[PDB]
Amino acid sequence: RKYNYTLLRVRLPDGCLLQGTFYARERLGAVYGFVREALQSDWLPFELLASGGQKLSEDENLALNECGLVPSALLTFSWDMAVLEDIKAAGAEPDSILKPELLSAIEKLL
Amino acid sequence: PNRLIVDEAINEDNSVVSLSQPKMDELQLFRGDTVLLKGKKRREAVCIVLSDDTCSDEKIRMNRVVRNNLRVRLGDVISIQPCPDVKYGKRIHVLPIDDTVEGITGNLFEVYLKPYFLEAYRPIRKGDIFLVRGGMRAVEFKVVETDPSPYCIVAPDTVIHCEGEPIKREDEEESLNEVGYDDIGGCRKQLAQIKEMVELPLRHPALFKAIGVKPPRGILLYGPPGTGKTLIARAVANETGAFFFLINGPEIMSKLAGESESNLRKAFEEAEKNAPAIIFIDELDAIAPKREKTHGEVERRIVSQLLTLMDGLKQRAHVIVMAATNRPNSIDPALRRFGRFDREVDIGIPDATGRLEILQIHTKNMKLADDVDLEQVANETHGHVGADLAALCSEAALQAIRKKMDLIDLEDETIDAEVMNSLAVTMDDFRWALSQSNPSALRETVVEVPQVTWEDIGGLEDVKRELQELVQYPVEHTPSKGVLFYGPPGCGKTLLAKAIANECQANFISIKGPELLTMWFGESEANVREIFDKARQAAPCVLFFDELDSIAKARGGNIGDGGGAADRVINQILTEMDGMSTKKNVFIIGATNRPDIIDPAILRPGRLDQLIYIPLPDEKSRVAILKANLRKSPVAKDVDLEFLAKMTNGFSGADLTEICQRACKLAIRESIESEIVPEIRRDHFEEAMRFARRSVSDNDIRKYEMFAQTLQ
Amino acid sequence: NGPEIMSKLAGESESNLRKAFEEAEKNAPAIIFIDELDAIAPKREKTHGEVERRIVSQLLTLMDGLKQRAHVIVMAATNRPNSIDPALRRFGRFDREVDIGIPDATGRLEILQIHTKNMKLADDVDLEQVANETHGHVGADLAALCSEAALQAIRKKMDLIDLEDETIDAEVMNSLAVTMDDFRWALSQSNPSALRETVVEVPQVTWEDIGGLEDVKRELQELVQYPVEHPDKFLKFGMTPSKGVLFYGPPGCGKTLLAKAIANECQANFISIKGPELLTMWFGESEANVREIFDKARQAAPCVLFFDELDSIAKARGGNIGDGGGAADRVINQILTEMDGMSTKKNVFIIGATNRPDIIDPAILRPGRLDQLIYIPLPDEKSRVAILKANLRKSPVAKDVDLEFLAKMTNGFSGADLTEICQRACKLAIRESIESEIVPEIRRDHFEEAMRFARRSVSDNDIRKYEMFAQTLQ
């Protein structure tokens, strides 16, 4: 009987950690929407990998308590392979994942 | 604070450990976060933390690979220190360990390291040793260079390099292919019993050196060959760190007088020098046979030397002696006196679950095809022990090897890793091996949890509750430890004993008429004591003595020879029952179809104090019986089971089953003939009704009802 | 010790045994103790080795040499008095023997007290309760319990005060007391080394423990005490005292208490032989164990030798059916022989019991054996009340408890069944008492609740069978 909410963290390629609060029954589409709003480029396709090695699909209507992400979990962030090939081929270093609007309020972990 | 006791892993993966969620909440880390673990000798390791429903609040679950990198052992304590600063690596250089790369060549990265790390995001620290399984070989690697330091997370964009000679293992490092606790399948309870008795004096010797009270000096492991008697002894020594000395009968008996006893006592002296240590003596019946069976001086004197060496263990602190035999009664009884080898464990034969676990252990390095179903194999391999399942996996591998190697034709000192990587073992290869394998433990009784549950028994709703209360009451709140069932045959007497064992997850020990008769006929009724001792070792279990009067009937029943109601075996059963306590977690159930001629002693206080009558099923029960028997088959909607039950007024449950099987057989025959219908139709049941008859007469019911009223 | 001498080579075992005797004479007075005598000198007819037959001959001659070796006594220990070569027990040599057996409840307490002489015990420690719980334990096990309880107290307190060294301040040691929890922990860790062996002891059952049967209690005193309290009257009138009595009737009426109660008042050992032992002797072809039983009585004297389940032999031959013959067999013939050879002047009285008197070999009831018959029926109205009152002597009973009403309902109950009612009502009162602290007496509700679970152990048909038999005997 211990839990009905979950806290998620996302490990970003640029060394930053993104955190947010969700219902234990929330769907994966709301987590992808949350991350898109936090990203510098909300349109740029990406994937979120769960702590158990299972990839989370944005188009799959699964709940966080069904995906093994409750009461808490860390997700691994990666851009879609299609855009990574163009970013690397062009010589563009993806050194910023999040929007400056959130980064200006970055806190240290304790 | 922030410290936990090291325990066994549930997830075998080498990059993850499991904590109880309340400790992850205190450390404010989430599932998947990367943490450092602080071990002994100022060593550390990096891993991912998850949680489960089984880890103790004050323990950390980690596998052998993680413990070896920390140079810690089960029972130690480590600190947990989250390290969120870890970043992704750019280049990591990994090289194999020489001890595992011999006879194999090719590109180890493409076969092992690449799929191991690909999209796995495993934490890696410089100096880490880890195992990658595949190609029927277990190959472990060490990390020699990391661009970030001292640890990082591997990413799909991280460069993985591997050039150079294999690395030699350090003398303080153990091979990951050495037998440990993760290599033992079934008999988990027996292993836990050894842990309680052995690990404490070896991990915490100070507790026993400060006091004059010695721990158990010897443990006798007995059971069929190939069940893990030596595997447990070695695994315990390897996990605790105690020195393991191997002795066996033939090695000592092959020596001449003087040399034999010298080698035996020399090993004991070495164990003290290397204490803590475990001395394992295999084939105890060969080194210490019963003296009345031999006139040789060598055999008698070796027993005398072993008897004194066991007594000397009160001086040889922290040395524990274990031995293996086939049966506790096949060795010189002097060894079993107070002290010495006064403690024994019955290993037994793994059940279907244990056999599956053993197969899964052996196939760890095997590449299996999608059609391979090891659970189905474990269900078919009745009578097999771990030694036979090892042979089964080997033979299945060899058949797969021949099929491909005939086409590969690689003749050299080593085999390419690539050709082994593409080699898979299919169900056809296991099926072939099953046809060639022959169980080594088919003669011994196999005892396991039955598959019969309460939903398989029609009627008798009150008897179901009575049995559940008899077992639950002494656990939830002198309670009885046994019940006698009487009544007509074919009403479920045996099923009741199995169903209560099933729901309790208890072992079911089935004794049938032929076994009771065998003991009587051969004047070997002393074997009853072994049956009761098995019931204790198998606890929790249900000890079911069917056909209690089978011997009385064999001796005449209604006429009679030189005996009457009592016999050699029932008197031994009565004797042994008086020695069993209600706290032994053994429930004794009897059954008879003629309760008027069974020695009434069995119902006297302290024995089978519960007495339950099982009548023929009534109309609603007969319908339930038909539905239970048909629960596994397609049945047409035109089948009126209530109509059948109304007609079969005098039928037993066994008689209703015959009707069901008759209709089933007819449905199958019709389907076969049509192909050369897909469900059982009323016509098949109506035909069965023309031949099925009641097996229990009205006169037999009156006999049982009169008995019931006589005893109340 | 046997196994050490046997571990030696031929010639070395004999020389070493001789040296011990020669050294004892030089150091006389001296005592030579040979442990595991059955290992150094096993029965010659049970072995094949020449060395084992030789070492027995060597010990036999050394024992005979004790007539010349002044002031030397040889003692030995074995597990079973009949597991050694009988030659050693012939006149001279080992002409004396003493049965040590297993300590009784009083001795076990004494052992616990001995091994706590130096131990500081807390007020909650109760060694008498431990001694009663440690059934099947011997001195080796009770000593372990004392040392283990000491260690637990030392690790809880002193190990957090002192260093890992050999020297401790006297004040720190004296400040350490052992609590009852440490003894209970050790009790759960220890396992009795002698739980299966029969234990013979003077029982604690007294006449006040038996409800009803007032005339039987007196009759046993006449049978057991009078022949030695007033021997001049038995001689004056030429009376031959009976050697024993057989009890018959329903089970659970106090037959075990009758034999124990007279043994208690007489301060005599109570030896309880059960059916399974008589069955083992017959089936195992070990009838010589009958002599062991009667010899135990002769060595344990004064004692009461109680043979329970006398019907077990007749049942072994079929009991209700069997062959066409009688109840005579090998075991009963050996038992009857030993009875005839036993004198009443050894302070041994034999009591038998059976629940099936109709199938007992009539020979046991002939003069010189268990010629007297006592019927023990189910307790009557006044006795059932007396039984309930006796069981409740150790606990306060509420004024609302009507023991006569309960006894009137339990018309078909035995004394054993009335005891369960009292014990269950006691447990129910305890359950309430424990909960009240998270009561001082047993209330009517506890007895009425117990009545819902208690049942009679003897059926109405069994009662008629026993009454008809007793009536047939007139």
Ligand SMILES: Nc1ncnc2c1ncn2[C@@H]1O[C@H](COP(=O)(O)OP(=O)(O)O)[C@@H](O)[C@H]1O
């Ligand atoms: N309970 C078991 N669990 C896992 N493997 C087992 C078990 N019992 C036997 N085996 C396997 O069978 C073989 C046993 O052979 P061996 O080492 O001689 O031990 P023993 O003959 O004492 O069982 C090993 O390969 C071992 O892995």
Ligand SMILES: Nc1ncnc2c1ncn2[C@@H]1O[C@H](COP(=O)(O)OP(=O)(O)O)[C@@H](O)[C@H]1O
């Ligand atoms: N109450 C019952 N419910 C369902 N099936 C029954 C029942 N009684 C007997 N049977 C059928 O009879 C068969 C034999 O039952 P079993 O308990 O082995 O009889 P017994 O105990 O007399 O040997 C079972 O396979 C079962 O299908």
Ligand SMILES: Nc1ncnc2c1ncn2[C@@H]1O[C@H](COP(=O)(O)OP(=O)(O)O)[C@@H](O)[C@H]1O
């Ligand atoms: N007349 C009685 N008075 C008091 N207690 C009795 C009486 N009869 C039986 N009991 C109780 O019943 C228990 C069993 O008695 P026992 O004589 O051993 O029966 P059994 O016939 O089984 O040997 C005893 O422990 C005793 O406490």
